C-alpha cells in the first residue's frame, strides 16, 4: 500500500504548492501598497518643502 | 520505497528553503514598514 501513501503525499504537496503561491501573492500585494505608500509620502514631503 | 522517500526528501528540502525565503521577505517588509512609519512620525512632529 505505497499507492495510498504516495497519494496522501501527492495531495499534501498539491496543498503546499497552493499555500506557496497564495503566500507569494499576499507578499506581492503588500510590497505594492507599501511602495505606493512610500511614493505618496515622499511626494508630500517634496510638496511641502 | 526508496522512490517514495527520495521524492519526499526532495519536497521537504524545497519546503525548508521556502520557509526561510518567506521569513526573509517578511523581515524586509517589517523593516520598510517600520522605517516609513518613522518618516511619517517625524514629518508630523515637524
Amino acid at each position: 500500500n505505497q499507492k495510498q501513501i504516495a497519494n496522501q503525499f501527492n495531495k499534501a504537496i498539491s496543498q503546499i504548492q497552493e499555500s506557496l503561491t497564495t503566500t507569494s501573492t499576499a507578499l506581492g500585494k503588500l510590497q505594492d501598497v507599501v511602495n505606493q505608500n512610500a511614493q505618496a509620502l515622499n511626494t508630500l514631503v517634496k510638496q511641502l518643502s | 520505497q526508496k522512490q517514495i522517500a527520495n521524492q519526499f526528501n526532495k519536497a521537504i528540502s524545497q519546503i525548508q528553503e521556502s520557509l526561510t525565503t518567506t521569513s526573509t521577505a517578511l523581515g524586509k517588509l517589517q523593516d520598510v514598514v517600520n522605517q516609513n512609519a518613522q518618516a511619517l512620525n517625524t514629518l508630523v512632529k515637524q
Binding site: K3, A6, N7, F9, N10, I13, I16, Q17, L20, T21, T23, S24, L27, G28, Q31, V34, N35, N37, A38, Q39, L41, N42, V45 | Q3, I4, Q7, F8, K10, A11, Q14, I15, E17, S18, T21, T22, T24, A25, K28, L29, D31, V32, V33, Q35, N36, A39, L40, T42, L43, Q46
Partner: peptide, 29 residues
C-alpha cells in the same frame, strides 16, 4: 525625511518557482 521602498521581488519569485518545481516531486502512481 525619505520613505524607502522594499524589494522582495527575488523572494516572491522563488516561492513561485518552488511551487513549480514541487511538480517534479509528485510520485508517479
Amino acid at each position: 525625511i525619505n520613505a524607502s521602498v522594499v524589494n522582495i521581488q527575488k523572494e516572491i519569485d522563488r516561492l513561485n518557482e518552488v511551487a513549480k518545481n514541487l511538480n517534479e516531486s509528485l510520485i508517479d502512481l
